[PDB]
Design a protein around this motif. Sequence first.
Motif, PDB file in Angstrom:
ATOM      1  N   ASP A   1       0.909  -1.171  -0.087  1.00 15.58           N
ATOM      2  CA  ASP A   1       0.107   0.015   0.177  1.00 15.58           C
ATOM      3  C   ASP A   1       0.869   1.128   0.201  1.00 15.58           C
ATOM      4  OD1 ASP A   1      -2.683  -1.107   2.208  1.00 15.58           O
ATOM      5  OD2 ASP A   1      -2.201  -1.649  -0.157  1.00 15.58           O
ATOM      6  N   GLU A   2       1.975   1.317   0.775  1.00  9.54           N
ATOM      7  CA  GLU A   2       2.733   2.362   1.210  1.00  9.54           C
ATOM      8  C   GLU A   2       3.644   2.780  -0.256  1.00  9.54           C
ATOM      9  OE1 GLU A   2       5.304   1.409   4.221  1.00  9.54           O
ATOM     10  OE2 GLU A   2       3.944   2.641   5.746  1.00  9.54           O
ATOM     11  N   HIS A   3       3.991   1.763  -0.891  1.00  8.57           N
ATOM     12  CA  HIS A   3       4.790   1.666  -2.237  1.00  8.57           C
ATOM     13  C   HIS A   3       3.886   2.424  -3.109  1.00  8.57           C
ATOM     14  CE1 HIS A   3       7.011   0.632  -5.897  1.00  8.57           C
ATOM     15  NE2 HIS A   3       5.850   0.100  -6.452  1.00  8.57           N
ATOM     16  N   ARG A   4       2.507   2.131  -3.187  1.00  9.06           N
ATOM     17  CA  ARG A   4       1.337   2.575  -4.258  1.00  9.06           C
ATOM     18  C   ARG A   4       0.955   3.689  -3.977  1.00  9.06           C
ATOM     19  NH1 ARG A   4      -2.381  -3.160  -4.934  1.00  9.06           N
ATOM     20  NH2 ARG A   4      -1.050  -3.886  -6.733  1.00  9.06           N
ATOM     21  N   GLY A   5       1.439   4.339  -3.020  1.00 12.52           N
ATOM     22  CA  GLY A   5       1.195   6.041  -2.504  1.00 12.52           C
ATOM     23  C   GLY A   5       2.348   6.771  -2.487  1.00 12.52           C
ATOM     24  N   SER A   6       3.565   6.168  -2.827  1.00 17.26           N
ATOM     25  CA  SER A   6       4.873   6.706  -2.748  1.00 17.26           C
ATOM     26  C   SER A   6       5.200   7.816  -4.032  1.00 17.26           C
ATOM     27  CB  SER A   6       6.245   5.594  -2.953  1.00 17.26           C
ATOM     28  OG  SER A   6       5.987   5.060  -4.223  1.00 17.26           O
ATOM     29  N   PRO A   7       5.913   8.699  -3.864  1.00 18.53           N
ATOM     30  CA  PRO A   7       6.101   9.944  -4.888  1.00 18.53           C
ATOM     31  C   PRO A   7       6.534   9.232  -6.236  1.00 18.53           C
ATOM     32  CG  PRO A   7       7.064  10.713  -2.734  1.00 18.53           C
ATOM     33  CD  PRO A   7       6.773   9.256  -2.563  1.00 18.53           C
ATOM     34  N   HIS A   8       7.590   8.323  -6.064  1.00 18.91           N
ATOM     35  CA  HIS A   8       7.987   7.621  -7.240  1.00 18.91           C
ATOM     36  C   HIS A   8       6.970   6.849  -8.059  1.00 18.91           C
ATOM     37  CE1 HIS A   8       9.331   5.364  -3.877  1.00 18.91           C
ATOM     38  NE2 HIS A   8       9.325   4.262  -4.466  1.00 18.91           N
ATOM     39  N   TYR A   9       6.141   6.197  -7.368  1.00 17.88           N
ATOM     40  CA  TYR A   9       5.080   5.452  -8.019  1.00 17.88           C
ATOM     41  C   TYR A   9       4.179   6.532  -8.507  1.00 17.88           C
ATOM     42  CZ  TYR A   9       1.304   2.041  -8.475  1.00 17.88           C
ATOM     43  OH  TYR A   9       0.191   1.276  -9.085  1.00 17.88           O
ATOM     44  N   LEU A  10       3.543   7.165  -7.790  1.00 16.40           N
ATOM     45  CA  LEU A  10       2.502   8.116  -8.437  1.00 16.40           C
ATOM     46  C   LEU A  10       3.180   8.624  -9.613  1.00 16.40           C
ATOM     47  CD1 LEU A  10       1.203  10.347  -5.296  1.00 16.40           C
ATOM     48  CD2 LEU A  10       0.443   8.118  -6.248  1.00 16.40           C
ATOM     49  N   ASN A  11       4.065   9.163  -9.869  1.00 20.39           N
ATOM     50  CA  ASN A  11       4.776   9.655 -11.194  1.00 20.39           C
ATOM     51  C   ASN A  11       4.595   8.580 -12.252  1.00 20.39           C
ATOM     52  OD1 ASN A  11       6.413  11.702 -12.576  1.00 20.39           O
ATOM     53  ND2 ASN A  11       7.802  10.090 -12.909  1.00 20.39           N
ATOM     54  N   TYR A  12       4.982   7.368 -11.970  1.00 23.71           N
ATOM     55  CA  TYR A  12       5.283   6.317 -12.762  1.00 23.71           C
ATOM     56  C   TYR A  12       3.469   5.964 -13.212  1.00 23.71           C
ATOM     57  CZ  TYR A  12       3.625   1.459 -13.256  1.00 23.71           C
ATOM     58  OH  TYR A  12       2.893   0.304 -13.546  1.00 23.71           O
ATOM     59  N   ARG A  13       2.694   6.145 -12.431  1.00 20.94           N
ATOM     60  CA  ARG A  13       1.286   5.520 -12.451  1.00 20.94           C
ATOM     61  C   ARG A  13       0.673   6.842 -13.468  1.00 20.94           C
ATOM     62  NH1 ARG A  13      -2.401   2.518  -9.364  1.00 20.94           N
ATOM     63  NH2 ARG A  13      -4.516   3.045 -10.244  1.00 20.94           N
ATOM     64  N   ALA A  14       1.040   7.866 -13.308  1.00 19.36           N
ATOM     65  CA  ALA A  14       0.668   9.044 -14.036  1.00 19.36           C
ATOM     66  C   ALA A  14       0.902   8.884 -15.483  1.00 19.36           C
ATOM     67  CB  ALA A  14       1.152  10.444 -13.522  1.00 19.36           C
ATOM     68  N   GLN A  15       1.962   8.311 -15.753  1.00 11.95           N
ATOM     69  CA  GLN A  15       2.517   8.330 -17.270  1.00 11.95           C
ATOM     70  C   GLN A  15       2.560   7.034 -18.070  1.00 11.95           C
ATOM     71  OE1 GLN A  15       6.328  10.437 -17.717  1.00 11.95           O
ATOM     72  NE2 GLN A  15       6.416  10.418 -15.339  1.00 11.95           N
ATOM     73  N   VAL A  16       2.414   5.878 -17.080  1.00 13.35           N
ATOM     74  CA  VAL A  16       2.791   4.508 -17.697  1.00 13.35           C
ATOM     75  C   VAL A  16       1.755   4.193 -18.778  1.00 13.35           C
ATOM     76  CG1 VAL A  16       1.420   3.158 -15.780  1.00 13.35           C
ATOM     77  CG2 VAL A  16       3.286   2.104 -17.223  1.00 13.35           C
ATOM     78  N   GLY A  17       0.438   4.478 -18.526  1.00 13.82           N
ATOM     79  CA  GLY A  17      -0.741   4.020 -19.398  1.00 13.82           C
ATOM     80  C   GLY A  17      -0.711   4.380 -20.940  1.00 13.82           C
ATOM     81  N   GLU A  18      -0.003   5.228 -20.965  1.00 13.90           N
ATOM     82  CA  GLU A  18       0.231   6.064 -22.403  1.00 13.90           C
ATOM     83  C   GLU A  18       1.265   5.712 -23.177  1.00 13.90           C
ATOM     84  OE1 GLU A  18      -0.233   8.058 -19.484  1.00 13.90           O
ATOM     85  OE2 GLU A  18      -2.310   8.342 -19.820  1.00 13.90           O
ATOM     86  N   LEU A  19       1.826   4.498 -22.833  1.00 15.46           N
ATOM     87  CA  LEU A  19       3.018   4.023 -23.472  1.00 15.46           C
ATOM     88  C   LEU A  19       2.546   2.590 -23.881  1.00 15.46           C
ATOM     89  CD1 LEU A  19       6.025   5.115 -21.096  1.00 15.46           C
ATOM     90  CD2 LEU A  19       4.993   6.169 -23.115  1.00 15.46           C
ATOM     91  N   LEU A  20       1.508   1.981 -23.235  1.00 14.86           N
ATOM     92  CA  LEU A  20       1.310   0.523 -23.475  1.00 14.86           C
ATOM     93  C   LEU A  20       0.259   0.355 -24.500  1.00 14.86           C
ATOM     94  CD1 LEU A  20       1.239  -0.235 -19.632  1.00 14.86           C
ATOM     95  CD2 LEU A  20       2.966  -0.361 -21.008  1.00 14.86           C
ATOM     96  N   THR A  21       0.136  -0.894 -25.048  1.00 13.49           N
ATOM     97  CA  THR A  21      -0.943  -1.529 -25.986  1.00 13.49           C
ATOM     98  C   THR A  21      -2.201  -1.782 -25.285  1.00 13.49           C
ATOM     99  OG1 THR A  21      -0.024  -3.741 -25.822  1.00 13.49           O
ATOM    100  CG2 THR A  21       0.861  -2.360 -27.541  1.00 13.49           C
ATOM    101  N   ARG A  22      -2.052  -2.175 -23.608  1.00 12.13           N
ATOM    102  CA  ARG A  22      -2.840  -2.830 -22.956  1.00 12.13           C
ATOM    103  C   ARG A  22      -2.474  -2.341 -21.667  1.00 12.13           C
ATOM    104  NH1 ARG A  22      -3.667  -8.252 -20.930  1.00 12.13           N
ATOM    105  NH2 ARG A  22      -3.679  -6.861 -19.165  1.00 12.13           N
ATOM    106  N   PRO A  23      -3.583  -2.353 -20.568  1.00 12.62           N
ATOM    107  CA  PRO A  23      -3.055  -1.794 -19.155  1.00 12.62           C
ATOM    108  C   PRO A  23      -2.165  -2.810 -18.570  1.00 12.62           C
ATOM    109  CG  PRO A  23      -5.565  -2.077 -19.486  1.00 12.62           C
ATOM    110  CD  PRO A  23      -4.841  -2.662 -20.642  1.00 12.62           C
ATOM    111  N   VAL A  24      -1.441  -2.472 -17.704  1.00 11.20           N
ATOM    112  CA  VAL A  24      -0.548  -3.355 -17.030  1.00 11.20           C
ATOM    113  C   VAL A  24      -1.151  -4.232 -16.460  1.00 11.20           C
ATOM    114  CG1 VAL A  24       1.404  -3.290 -14.994  1.00 11.20           C
ATOM    115  CG2 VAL A  24       0.812  -1.465 -16.116  1.00 11.20           C
TER     116      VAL A  24
END
Lengths: 98, 101
Positions: free
Chosen positions: A63-86
């Motif tokens: 849970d803590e990882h999923r709220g972290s500054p690094h995770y949030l930044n990743y989650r904001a950007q990852v979707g736009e790079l993929l053919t389908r969701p993670v």
Amino acid sequence: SPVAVIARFMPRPDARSALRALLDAMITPTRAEDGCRSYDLYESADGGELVLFERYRSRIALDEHRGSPHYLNYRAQVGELLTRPVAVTVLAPLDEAS
Amino acid sequence: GMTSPVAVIARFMPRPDARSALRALLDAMITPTRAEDGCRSYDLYESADGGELVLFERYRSRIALDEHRGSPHYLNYRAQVGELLTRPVAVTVLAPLDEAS
């Protein structure tokens, strides 16, 4: 108590480099989390997916990882790079030697 | 290359009635596989939603994975596993990009 995650990423061909960069930047801060036991990055043999295997001390740690500054930044950007969701699978150990 | 470490994810989707049988089949693989000179790790999980059992395996080289796949324990397992599942084992071979020691 502990938990693991498999996360699989299928990048758009033109977004593979950007995906690799995004995931690369997660490694250091994630491994530095108090509750992160391991965090490893792979490429499938057929080259179609990048895979992260992650291990945490508790559900709370995940849970803590999923709220972290690094995770949030990743989650904001990852979707736009993929053919389908993670493709994410959370795991509970049955027999993990360590 | 062939001397480079590799990992494998294997996902199993048992029939409900076959779940304890699958667990026993996979359990029997653990000691002999971990005992392989070339096996770095071999760990069994269940998915959070309970629908899958998952092995995460790490080998010191692709050669070591080939040795595993020729072993008496693997061949015994391969002969029996499919009959317990709703679909074939889903196997992914992985090349490390950043795997910590």
